[PDB]
Nucleic acid binder design. Structure first.
Ligand SMILES: [Mg+2]
Ligand SMILES: [Mg+2]
Ligand SMILES: [Mg+2]
Ligand SMILES: [Mg+2]
Ligand SMILES: [Mg+2]
Ligand SMILES: [Mg+2]
Ligand SMILES: [Mg+2]
Ligand SMILES: [Mg+2]
Ligand SMILES: [Mg+2]
Ligand SMILES: [Mg+2]
Ligand SMILES: [Mg+2]
Ligand SMILES: [Mg+2]
Ligand SMILES: [Mg+2]
Ligand SMILES: [Mg+2]
Ligand SMILES: [Mg+2]
Ligand SMILES: [Mg+2]
Ligand SMILES: [Mg+2]
Ligand SMILES: [Mg+2]
Ligand SMILES: [Mg+2]
Ligand SMILES: [Mg+2]
Ligand SMILES: [Zn+2]
Lengths: 116, 122, 53, 110
RNA sequence: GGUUCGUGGUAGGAGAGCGUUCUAAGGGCGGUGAAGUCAGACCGGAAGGACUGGUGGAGCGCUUAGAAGUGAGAAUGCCGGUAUGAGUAGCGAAAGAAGGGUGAGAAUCCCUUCCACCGAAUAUCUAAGGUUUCCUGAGGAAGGCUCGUCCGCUCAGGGUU
RNA sequence: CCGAUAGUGAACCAGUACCGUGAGGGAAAGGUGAAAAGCACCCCGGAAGGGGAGUGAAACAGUUCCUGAAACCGUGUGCCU
RNA sequence: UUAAGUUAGAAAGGGCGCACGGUGGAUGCCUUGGCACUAGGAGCCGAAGAAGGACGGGACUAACACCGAUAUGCUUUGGG
């Protein structure tokens, strides 16, 4: 029996074109360039799930550095201080205190100075 | 002066044809560019007419076309464009210094969008 | 000589920003009561709006 | 409330009809008809007949006020293309698209 | 069921599967709306699968097996459609003008006048070749490189002794 | 076994049209509806084509008329420029 | 008022999203036609003019089909 290429092709290509929603010009209309754009988007998203983790740690460190220099410590001294003190609060939590509860951050910065 | 998409001899022929038409019919419809050239040539023919003497008649005769305007019936004799210029048109502008013609803007022609005008004696 | 790349829809549409007609220069006549080109004769009345013929 | 007329498969290229239809969009019908009368384009007469047809529809069928009408919508859709051939040099024939237009005008009160 | 060690990968080996058409058998859905089609923020580890609503208007799933014209993005692939270049190149040697007419509409059809061109031809016969193109009356979709009321075009009648 | 790019080259006036001096080469092109009930009449328009009205289960089924994807062409606008 | 500073808004046109159309003829459903076979039959026509054609035949007939100046049919036997 003959199997004509009916429907499966259109269904598969239309899904890929829908994933290219919002892309510029031909990239959200045409299967050949949409399929490239979607493959490339997935590759970037994979790469950026790793890069995101690096980027946020750089942001936190920069904020901890700013708040620590207001207490006459560098980031490198404060983090050494907190390690010697035995304080295990991570950079995301420290950066949060440095923006939202500076009084609490100053308390930890004192604990750091004491350990040094 | 305007070149009207024509060679020198073609342009002289065109100017003579239109000049005669305006003297014969007294009101013609043509393109704006043609009308703006015709006013110069027709007003000079009427000037020759106002001058009236044989020398001016022969200067006009060198330009005006040998066309019959009408047949008057006295026997019946024809009236030639040159006779009309010197016997009919010229005298009616005896007291008027210049400005024997006027151009009324009509509108664009269907087939080529050419801006058409009425040019008329007065 | 020949297009190196096809022109995108956006680029084609930008090029055509200036490919358009202007509105004709027209106005309502008093004697006619209808629109006419300025400095032209009004056919509705059948003469020049000012100068009677 | 609104009245529409369509001229289907008019033998004029859509681009050539659109450049004119763009003048009358949003205008009062009186001004629209004037604009078309004094726009020297092949499309102007064709669009005028569609617009006057739409106005007649508005007056006869729906009993709207003709003095009060505005061109609510006007647009040109592609019709079926006539395919022709022009003989070029060296025995080659080049395609000629004799394109057609569907010209729609909608008129409304205000 | 735990424990331990593993899980980058081209050619390539191995395995498990998804989906398509058809058949069988069971069991179903469907004019209270089948397939297809469109949309969506749903589900599965993937291939993929549902649900809901629009369109559609009569056929189609599911389970287990079976059989294959069984899966496309590339072949300067084949066929069709539609873009881009672009309102761009081009519109194929040449003199036209105005008045009058016709017509829904006229640079382009008809008439008049003037102008211009060929004239050992761009004139008159005639063979070949073509085969109705000839005449008359209607026509203006397409054809005519524009227009068209006109035509070697369309439709009727005719016409060659 | 095929179901209209398939199956014959040919589902349709196909070895036709068309190409070629000739031998020869050689297409494209299926579907209104159950029934013509194939849109009287009115309106704009020279016509074409529309808008009503009517028929029909449906006319967004209107003489090539089941469905009607994508490219491509437009109108409108929420956010951006 | 002056000065210094800051910030908004804009669309000739364009982008993204959505909605609604057009074009186009994919898809599904359908089948007038094909494809491969099986069983049986039949395997030749022609000077008594074949195969295959040309031109004709209708009230009007361009085409197809049918027919041959007895031409869109004639005689006869059966069926209905
Ligand atoms: Mg000379
Ligand atoms: Mg040649
Ligand atoms: Mg691996
Ligand atoms: Mg590893
Ligand atoms: Mg293997
Ligand atoms: Mg099926
Ligand atoms: Mg479909
Ligand atoms: Mg295959
Ligand atoms: Mg392809
Ligand atoms: Mg260019
Ligand atoms: Mg140029
Ligand atoms: Mg040019
Ligand atoms: Mg020429
Ligand atoms: Mg010689
Ligand atoms: Mg003739
Ligand atoms: Mg034409
Ligand atoms: Mg004629
Ligand atoms: Mg076939
Ligand atoms: Mg199909
Ligand atoms: Mg159709
Ligand atoms: Zn006036």
């Amino acid at each position: 029996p003959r199997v004509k290429g009916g429907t499966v092709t259109r269904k598969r290509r239309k899904k890929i074109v829908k994933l290219a929603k919002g892309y510029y010009g031909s990239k959200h209309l045409l299967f050949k360039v949409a399929n490239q754009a979607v493959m490339k988007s997935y590759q970037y998203a994979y790469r950026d799930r790793r890069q995101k983790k690096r980027d946020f740690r750089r942001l936190w460190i920069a904020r901890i550095n700013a708040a620590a220099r207001m207490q006459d410590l560098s980031y490198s001294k404060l983090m050494h201080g907190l390690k010697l003190a035995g304080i295990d609060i991570n950079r995301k939590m420290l950066a949060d205190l440095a923006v939202n509860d500076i009084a609490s951050f100053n308390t930890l910065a004192d604990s750091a100075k004491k350990a040094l | 002066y305007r070149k009207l998409g024509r060679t020198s001899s073609q342009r002289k022929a065109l100017l003579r044809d239109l000049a005669t038409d305006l003297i014969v019919f007294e009101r013609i419809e043509t393109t704006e560019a043609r009308a703006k050239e015709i006013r110069k040539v027709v007003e000079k023919l009427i000037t020759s007419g106002k001058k009236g003497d044989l020398h001016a008649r022969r200067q006009a005769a060198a330009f005006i076309r040998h066309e019959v305007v009408e047949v008057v019936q006295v026997k019946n004799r024809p009236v030639y464009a040159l006779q009309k210029l010197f016997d009919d048109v010229a005298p009616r502008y005896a007291e008027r210094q210049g400005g024997y013609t006027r151009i009324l803007k009509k509108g664009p022609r269907r087939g080529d969008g050419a801006p058409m005008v009425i040019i008329e004696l007065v | 000589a020949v297009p190196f790349r096809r022109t995108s829809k956006a680029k084609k549409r930008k090029r055509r920003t200036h490919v358009k007609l202007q509105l004709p220069g027209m106005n309502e006549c008093s004697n006619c009561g209808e629109y006419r080109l300025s400095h032209h004769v009004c056919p509705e009345c059948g003469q020049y709006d000012g100068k009677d013929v | 409330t609104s009245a529409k007329a369509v001229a289907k498969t008019v033998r004029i290229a859509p681009r050539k009809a659109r450049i004119v239809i763009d003048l009358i969009r949003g205008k009062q019908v009186g001004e629209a008809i004037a604009i078309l009368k004094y726009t020297p384009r092949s499309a102007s007469p064709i669009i005028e007949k569609v617009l006057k047809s739409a106005i007649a529809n508005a007056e006869h069928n729906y009993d709207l006020d003709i003095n009060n009408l505005v061109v609510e919508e006007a647009f040109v859709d592609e019709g079926p293309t006539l395919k022709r051939f022009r003989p070029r040099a060296q025995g080659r024939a080049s395609a000629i698209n004799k394109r057609t237009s569907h010209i729609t005008v909608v008129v409304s009160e205000v």
